[PDB]
Design a protein around this ligand. Structure first.
Ligand SMILES: NC(=O)c1ccc[n+]([C@@H]2O[C@H](COP(=O)([O-])OP(=O)(O)OC[C@H]3O[C@@H](n4cnc5c(N)ncnc54)[C@H](O)[C@@H]3O)[C@@H](O)[C@H]2O)c1
Ligand SMILES: NC(=O)c1ccc[n+]([C@@H]2O[C@H](COP(=O)([O-])OP(=O)(O)OC[C@H]3O[C@@H](n4cnc5c(N)ncnc54)[C@H](O)[C@@H]3O)[C@@H](O)[C@H]2O)c1
Ligand SMILES: [Zn+2]
Ligand SMILES: [Zn+2]
Ligand SMILES: [Zn+2]
Ligand SMILES: [Zn+2]
Lengths: 374, 374
């Protein structure tokens, strides 16, 4: 039994920006009150984990990254009531405390206990459960899933179906839920509408899935890598366009194609220029544009507010607008009942020990999601 | 008899930017097919008319400005079916053709026949009905209400109750409808919510009226002119703040006052900086901010898109989101049935010959709405 004891295990530690991960031994403390220690089973490689390496997404270093994952509870701290040893779980990078003004609001999901807005890289109590080479290591988004074992606060974990295939449903911990919810919950895509989706990676393909589920008549995929078009069409895109093929700006192209602007547009990349382009291509009187991508830290965009005065709506969201702990178990149940598919997002599988090759695949443009198995 | 003949009458001509209006004789041609010639009875002085003088709003000069008014039909051109000679009418600076994609959409109101996006300063047929000293004079937003007689396209006029008081209901042609609709239709203010309103002129006071009608619990007025506060409280503000009284940015003040950000905020001034401040002060996960003010031509704002990624919604609108020809007659009927008040907006009632004095009252901070009577 390991309950109440320190666990020594392997993790992928990031000591420095712009360097490979280091797979080495870490010490994982036992859970304190209202904490849960999880044996990880599978984790996806999401572009936000790469943003930590590139310095796009700022969080304290050294760190154990990873936020899209699934595993099995090893032990629970005092007072935990929502999970037990042996349960299958998904860590929640957006917590759901259930008690703050956001958690009590009908639409809000960005719980005030989050570690996203002004990151500390700690547990809720301001301390760390990890040491490596005798030095304390930061957490990432309260989850730190690039480790054989992690410790999370109870408000950052959801119990899921015991029969769930963890190597698939890890994607409900970030990319699938974010893109799908951005379409069905945040934008509220309507039947018969025209949508434009900028960026055709795992999250943008999930936005396409949600637009098709909502009954859109036209779904235009936009990417500078034409090798992403075939899979976009498989999951519902009706047409795809590469901005590099055109002499005019793509907002003009899209407005012409849609006979005056699209109903719904989505930025699913992380660039300031494509956020403004995506807003401009929606119809000026009644269009809606949703920002999903994460841009380089602390940088401001420039835009003309007359784009809004005519009638456009501009919004963003984290995790598809879903209240995390209520929604994740229901999304897994819907997956088990074949209400949506996850296999189209999975292009590569590797053992955890080959995490750096998995990041190389993402950076080269070759992969959508690589799933790592422990 | 004036029907079918050129009319000579007085108008306020603006020959160049940054000069007083010239009150002099103009010639007004008879209406062509699908056009309506109107004898003006009352017109309000709105800040957007002043924006033409100051160069904030670019439109072809020389011009007859004025867009908030009410009058009586003098004659109709061939083919007109919606008004007749002797009817009371309000000119519509946002048209409603009924046939374009926007007019057919459930939410949109920015009809594609508008002269707001890329102003030509003409009738729909690309010509002008006004001459002055032998020279052609431009129209303004298809309305040109600063003249004893004007000619408007049929899609730019609504028939209203024959018993309505024209010296009051002229406000339904711009300021009342814009502010009220921005609250009740565009933002969709909810019962029990907290609202912040930036700018306490005629339009901002109308936003307050709409927030109170919608059941808001708290309505915080924001203005650098504290002389505006008493009237704001009379029409529903619960508190008023002056940014110049504080050592920290007003977005921080308003976030603290609202225990973490307001539900709804409104920019009703026309400044880039207050547009970004108003967005920032709404709650980061579920707040909504609406731009109503018109800022200086061709100038971009700078903002951090993380303000939207957390969950905020940013939108703007023209004319409160109301489909103009359908809505104006109903708003007049609602006024006649005592559903809202217009008197609180009116501080001064002057003859038309005093237009320049009326603009000086607005610029000095001393008036809300001056109504000019012909
Ligand atoms: N808001 C949230 O809650 C949330 C959660 C999921 C991920 N993220 C963000 O979502 C974004 C997408 O993540 P992903 O894992 O799908 O990434 P990804 O890298 O797999 O996909 C991005 C796609 O954008 C395309 N692209 C890059 N530059 C482009 C340009 N200039 N024009 C057009 N296309 C361009 C790429 O070719 C690529 O296919 C990232 O910024 C990530 O950080 C946000
Ligand atoms: N979107 C539309 O359809 C629409 C229709 C109505 C008018 N407009 C615009 O609405 C705005 C308001 O019009 P109005 O007639 O009520 O104007 P107004 O001049 O009567 O009122 C503006 C108010 O803003 C306050 N103000 C100015 N600078 C400020 C600052 N830095 N901080 C705080 N308060 C400040 C002033 O003291 C004043 O009370 C204008 O820009 C006008 O052009 C837009
Ligand atoms: Zn919470
Ligand atoms: Zn992610
Ligand atoms: Zn129309
Ligand atoms: Zn106006």
């Amino acid at each position: 039994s390991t309950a109440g004891k320190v666990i020594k295990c392997k993790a992928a530690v990031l000591w420095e920006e712009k360097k490979p991960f280091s797979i080495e031994e870490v010490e994982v403390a036992p859970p304190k009150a209202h904490e849960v220690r999880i044996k990880m089973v599978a984790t996806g490689i999401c572009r936000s984990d790469d943003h930590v390496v590139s310095g796009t997404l700022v969080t304290p270093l050294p760190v154990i990254a990873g936020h899209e994952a699934a595993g099995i509870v090893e032990s629970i701290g005092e007072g935990v009531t929502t999970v037990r040893p042996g349960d299958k779980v998904i860590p929640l990078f957006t917590p759901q405390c259930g008690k703050c003004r956001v958690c009590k609001h009908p639409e809000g999901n960005f719980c005030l206990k989050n570690d996203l807005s002004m990151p500390r890289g700690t547990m809720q109590d301001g301390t760390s459960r990890f040491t490596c080479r005798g030095k304390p290591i930061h957490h990432f988004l309260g989850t730190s899933t690039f480790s054989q074992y992690t410790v999370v606060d109870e408000i950052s974990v959801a119990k899921i179906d015991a029969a769930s295939p963890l190597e698939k449903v890890c994607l409900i911990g970030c990319g699938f839920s974010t893109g799908y919810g951005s379409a069905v919950k945040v934008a509220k895509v309507t039947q018969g509408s025209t949508c434009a989706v900028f960026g055709l990676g795992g999250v943008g393909l999930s936005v396409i899935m949600g637009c098709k589920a909502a009954g859109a008549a036209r779904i235009i995929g936009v990417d500078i890598n034409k090798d992403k078009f075939a899979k976009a069409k498989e999951v519902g895109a009706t047409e795809c366009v590469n901005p590099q093929d055109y002499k005019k700006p793509i907002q003009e192209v899209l407005t012409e194609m849609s006979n005056g602007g699209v109903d719904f547009s989505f930025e699913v990349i992380g660039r300031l220029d494509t956020m403004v382009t995506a807003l401009s291509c929606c119809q000026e009187a009644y269009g809606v544009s949703v920002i999903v991508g994460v841009p380089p830290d602390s940088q401001n965009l420039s835009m003309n507010p007359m784009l809004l005065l005519s009638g456009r709506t501009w919004k963003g969201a984290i995790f598809g607008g879903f209240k995390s702990k209520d929604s994740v178990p229901k999304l897994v149940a819907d997956f088990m009942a074949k209400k949506f598919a996850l296999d189209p997002l999975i292009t590569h599988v590797l053992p955890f020990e080959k995490i750096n090759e998995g990041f190389d695949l993402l950076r080269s443009g070759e992969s959508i999601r690589t799933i790592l198995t422990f």
